[PDB]
Amino acid sequence: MGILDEVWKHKLILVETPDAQETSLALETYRKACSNGRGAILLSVARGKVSEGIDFDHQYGRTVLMIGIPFQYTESRILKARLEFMRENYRIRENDFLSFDAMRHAAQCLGRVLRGKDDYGVMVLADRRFSRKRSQLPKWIAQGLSDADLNLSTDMAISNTKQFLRT
Amino acid sequence: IRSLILTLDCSEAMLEKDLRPNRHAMIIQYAIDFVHEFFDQNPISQMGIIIMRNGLAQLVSQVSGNPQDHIDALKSIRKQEPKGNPSLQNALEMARGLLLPVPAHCTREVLIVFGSLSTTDPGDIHQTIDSLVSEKIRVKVLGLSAQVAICKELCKATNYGDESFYKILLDETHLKELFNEAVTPXXXXXXXXXXXXXXXXXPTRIFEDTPTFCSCHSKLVYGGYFCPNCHSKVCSLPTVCPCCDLMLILXXXXXXXXXXXXXXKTFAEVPTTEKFRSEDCFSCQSRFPXXXXXXXXXXXXXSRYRCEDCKQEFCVDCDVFIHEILHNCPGCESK
Amino acid sequence: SPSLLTVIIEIAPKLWTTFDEEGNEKGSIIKVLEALIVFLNAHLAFNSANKVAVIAAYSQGIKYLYPXXXXXXXXXXXXXXXXXXXXXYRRFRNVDETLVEEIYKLFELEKKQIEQNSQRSTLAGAMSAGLTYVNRISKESVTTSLKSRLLVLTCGSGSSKDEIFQYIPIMNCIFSATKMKCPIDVVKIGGSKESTFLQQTTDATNGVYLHVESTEGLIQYLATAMFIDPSLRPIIVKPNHGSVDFRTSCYLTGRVVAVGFICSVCLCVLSIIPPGNKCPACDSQFDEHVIAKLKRK
Amino acid sequence: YPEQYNYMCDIKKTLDVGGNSILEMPSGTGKTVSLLSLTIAYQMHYPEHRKIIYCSRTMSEIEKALVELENLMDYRTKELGYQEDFRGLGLTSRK
Ligand SMILES: [Zn+2]
Numbered sequence: 045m046g047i048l049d050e051v052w053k054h055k056l057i058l059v060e061t062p063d064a065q066e067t068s069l070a071l072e073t074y075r076k077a078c079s080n081g082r083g084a085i086l087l088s089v090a091r092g093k094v095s096e097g098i099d100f101d102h103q104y105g106r107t108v109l110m111i112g113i114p115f116q117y118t119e120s121r122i123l124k125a126r127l128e129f130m131r132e133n134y135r136i137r138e139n140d141f142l143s144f145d146a147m148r149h150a151a152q153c154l155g156r157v158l159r160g161k162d163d164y165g166v167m168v169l170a171d172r173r174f175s176r177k178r179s180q181l182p183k184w185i186a187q188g189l190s191d192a193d194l195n196l197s198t199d200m201a202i203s204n205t206k207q208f209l210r211t
Numbered sequence: 212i213r214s215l216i217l218t219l220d221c222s223e224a225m226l227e228k229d230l231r232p233n234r235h236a237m238i239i240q241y242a243i244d245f246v247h248e249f250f251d252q253n254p255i256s257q258m259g260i261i262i263m264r265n266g267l268a269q270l271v272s273q274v275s276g277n278p279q280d281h282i283d284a285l286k287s288i289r290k291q292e293p294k295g296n297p298s299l300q301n302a303l304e305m306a307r308g309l310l311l312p313v314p315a316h317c318t319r320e321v322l323i324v325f326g327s328l329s330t331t332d333p334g335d336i337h338q339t340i341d342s343l344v345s346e347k348i349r350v351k352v353l354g355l356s357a358q359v360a361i362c363k364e365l366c367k368a369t370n371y372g373d374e375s376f377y378k379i380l381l382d383e384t385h386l387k388e389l390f391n392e393a394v395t396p397x398x399x400x401x402x403x404x405x406x407x408x409x410x411x412x413x414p415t416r417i418f419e420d421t422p423t424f425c426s427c428h429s430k431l432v433y434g435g436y437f438c439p440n441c442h443s444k445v446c447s448l449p450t451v452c453p454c455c456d457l458m459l460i461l462x463x464x465x466x467x468x469x470x471x472x473x474x475x476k477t478f479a480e481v482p483t484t485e486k487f488r489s490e491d492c493f494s495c496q497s498r499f500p501x502x503x504x505x506x507x508x509x510x511x512x513x514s515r516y517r518c519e520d521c522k523q524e525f526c527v528d529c530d531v532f533i534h535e536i537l538h539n540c541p542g543c544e545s546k
Numbered sequence: 547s548p549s550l551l552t553v554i555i556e557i558a559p560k561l562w563t564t565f566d567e568e569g570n571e572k573g574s575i576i577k578v579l580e581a582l583i584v585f586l587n588a589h590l591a592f593n594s595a596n597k598v599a600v601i602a603a604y605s606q607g608i609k610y611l612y613p614x615x616x617x618x619x620x621x622x623x624x625x626x627x628x629x630x631x632x633x634x635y636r637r638f639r640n641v642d643e644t645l646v647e648e649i650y651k652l653f654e655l656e657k658k659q660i661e662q663n664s665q666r667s668t669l670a671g672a673m674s675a676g677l678t679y680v681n682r683i684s685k686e687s688v689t690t691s692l693k694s695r696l697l698v699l700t701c702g703s704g705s706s707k708d709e710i711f712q713y714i715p716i717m718n719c720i721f722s723a724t725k726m727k728c729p730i731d732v733v734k735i736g737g738s739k740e741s742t743f744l745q746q747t748t749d750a751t752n753g754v755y756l757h758v759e760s761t762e763g764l765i766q767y768l769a770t771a772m773f774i775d776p777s778l779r780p781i782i783v784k785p786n787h788g789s790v791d792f793r794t795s796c797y798l799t800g801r802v803v804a805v806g807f808i809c810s811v812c813l814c815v816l817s818i819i820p821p822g823n824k825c826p827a828c829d830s831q832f833d834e835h836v837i838a839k840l841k842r843k
Numbered sequence: 844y845p846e847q848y849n850y851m852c853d854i855k856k857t858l859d860v861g862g863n864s865i866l867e868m869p870s871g872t873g874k875t876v877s878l879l880s881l882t883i884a885y886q887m888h889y890p891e892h893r894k895i896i897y898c899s900r901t902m903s904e905i906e907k908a909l910v911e912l913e914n915l916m917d918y919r920t921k922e923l924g925y926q927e928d929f930r931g932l933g934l935t936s937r938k
Pocket residue numbers: 438439440441442443452453454455456457
């Protein structure tokens with residue numbers, strides 16, 4: 045809990061049974077954390093509720109983290125029925141169900157970082173299966189986890205110096 | 212005229228080894244040179260050092276025009292270790308309590324050297340930012356690498372609605388550049404207010420050291436400045452006398468005003484094939500060609516810095532030397 | 547070690563007329579220049595590789611008498627002197643030949659236009675270019691830094707040799723000379739008159755001020771200031787006394803005020819006896835509350 | 844912006860020709876791009892012709908479309924000075 049006592053302090057974790065008041069209180073306190081020089085950790089579900097979309101400020105998370113790639117609940121009768129239904133229609137068996145669905149659940153995370161050309165943001169993606177799919181503005185460089193810690197320290201200082209240079 | 216309040220970060224975030232050997236060993240070291248850069252160009256201004264250690268604000272240097280009080284205050288910080296967390300609210304409220312003796316005629320400045328990324332404030336910090344605009348306090352924060360959303364509102368709302376004061380440092384060479392601009396004043400557009408100051412006596416240079424004389428210490432002295440109002444032989448300084456609240460400056464204020472009135476006219480660098488003049492310098496003797504990149508397409512071209520105030524040819528070396536000290540171009544004094 | 551001596555001569559047509567009228571002719575301009583050439587040869591013989599630069603300040607503008615100015619124009623011949631026939635260092639004889647060619651051009655340029663242009667002071671441009679050429683000569687010689695010791699030779703004549711227009715640029719030059727760690731060996735020549743700006747420049751730049759009235763001994767005062775300027779100041783020197791001034795004067799009035807008053811955030815010199823109606827120094831508004839408290843006390 | 848006029852020229856060419864168009868927009872930069880072009884294509888045709896029908900996915904995008912329409916009416920009442928036939932209805936939930 046060192047990040048929950050010396051970095052982000054308070055914790056904003058979205059549960060599986062996310063209440064509408066609980067999602068409202070975790071959203072306002074996340075805006076109260078960044079407006080006091082604190083910062084908070086928004087532990088949400090990419091498959092859960094509240095897809096958001098409001099940003100365009102420094103109150104939002106400037107660095108957005110994703111745990112791997114979004115997946116879908118397999119071994120269900122609803123999925124096996126829609127698998128054979130679209131197999132006769134478009135013959136996209138075992139392809140779009142694991143990739144086109146996994147992209148749109150990841151593209152909801154991509155819609156929050158791009159908050160205009162005036163605000164910056166860094167979106168990191170794990171694993172290696174993301175290279176087989178496409179993304180909005182496909183300019184992606186692959187590096188390690190400890191390597192990007194020194195890259196993001198440069199990206200949090202170059203963007204503070206190149207903001208008044210391009211104007 | 213100026214009453215700067217230095218706000219230094221002295222916490223566990225300064226224990227990192229970003230600089231050489233660390234952040235705290237270069238912030239304290241470069242601030243001693245900033246004291247030397249401040250009292251030379253502004254010998255009749257004030258300074259105040261407030262550290263942010265252990266979630267509080269500790270006053271280690273009182274507001275005074277003596278430069279040696281701020282040197283020995285910074286020599287005690289390097290002995291201990293910076294611990295705790297920065298407190299921006301306790302540092303600004305302590306800076307508010309010292310700038311209230313500072314009048315409206317003297318400019319109130321607050322410089323914050325913030326190398327951390329997270330602070331610990333008691334109450335609401337937004338109630339402290341709006342208080343600095345109500346009494347007109349110019350706050351400037353120097354943030355390290357990443358930007359803080361608090362310092363963007365602090366360097367804009369306290370600075371006439373303009374965010375350009377929250378600077379981001381990336382090198383130790385760039386940190387000394389921030390101490391050169393902060394040593395210079397900020398002649399802004401202001402808010403068009405009235406200004407009138409009087410009661411400025413002159414110090415008589417006395418050298419009596421037989422049984423000595425001291426009105427501000429009652430000790431032995433090798434000569435002190437005599438006040439022209441209360442007739443007291445106190446300490447020799449260009450500040451105010453401590454017996455009747457009257458000044459005692461001389462040519463130190465005149466040298467600061469001459470630098471303030473120095474507009475520094477840069478000489479127009481015209482080529483030797485364009486200005487139709489030989490390679491010569493109005494300050495010395497620059498009889499060498501400037502440009503010499505190509506064969507004869509640049510060596511014969513050259514450059515002669517023609518100052519437009521007297522049409523005198525010069526070079527690039529003395530054009531920055533005349534704008535730094537003395538008068539801008541020596542050909543201006545001759546008609 | 548080498549020692550650089552910067553001599554700032556103040557050649558003017560009123561200085562030769564005051565020395566040929568006040569106390570009859572107590573020495574012409576070439577009589578003291580020969581004794582200065584004897585002091586220049588003693589400085590070059592006191593230490594090896596001793597550099598010297600001569601820069602005059604005429605009425606129509608300042609000019610360099612020596613410092614390879616006549617050689618730079620020749621590259622881009624003598625005047626038959628007795629000093630050149632007496633041998634002893636050809637570098638000192640070529641400096642006297644270049645000074646004789648520059649003094650002949652000064653008498654050819656002295657006419658009705660030079661006497662009409664003698665209304666200002668060329669010592670402000672000679673001090674601004676003198677510290678810049680000394681900064682250019684010290685930058686050209688990185689190995690073995692010499693001791694830069696400026697020796698101002700102001701000829702206190704008539705007309706308007708000292709005014710408020712040249713005191714502001716000399717104050718910026720004195721702050722530049724104190725920042726460059728250069729001593730200003732001042733020498734008040736001519737009539738019996740001591741300037742407060744020349745006394746404050748010798749106290750701020752750690753120089754020596756010598757008041758030479760009329761003429762007296764030319765080499766007697768040239769062998770005393772040559773023993774403290776080229777040296778590293780091992781003694782406590784022997785400068786002129788009664789130089790302790792307030793270093794301030796009311797420019798809008800014309801008299802020295804003990805208690806001054808600031809302008810409207812401009813730091814201009816103003817008397818406390820003024821009412822300050824919209825600050826008599828620039829175009830700005832004054833404080834009515836500060837004018838109400840100053841009129842009561 | 845010139846990049847916003849590229850999708851606006853495509854929206855002015857598909858609304859008077861095509862029946863359905865899959866137009867891709869960058870994230871955080873395409874909200875008011877099709878908002879002003881929908882009121883301009885009606886003003887280029889007839890203002891009582893085809894009205895605007897908006898289909899969001901959340902209630903927040905319903906609320907975010909109302910404040911942008913206020914900016915469209917403020918840009919039409921300050922740059923023109925004429926108050927035309929207003930519209931806009933906030934069809935939200937029943938509770
Ligand atoms: Zn006093």
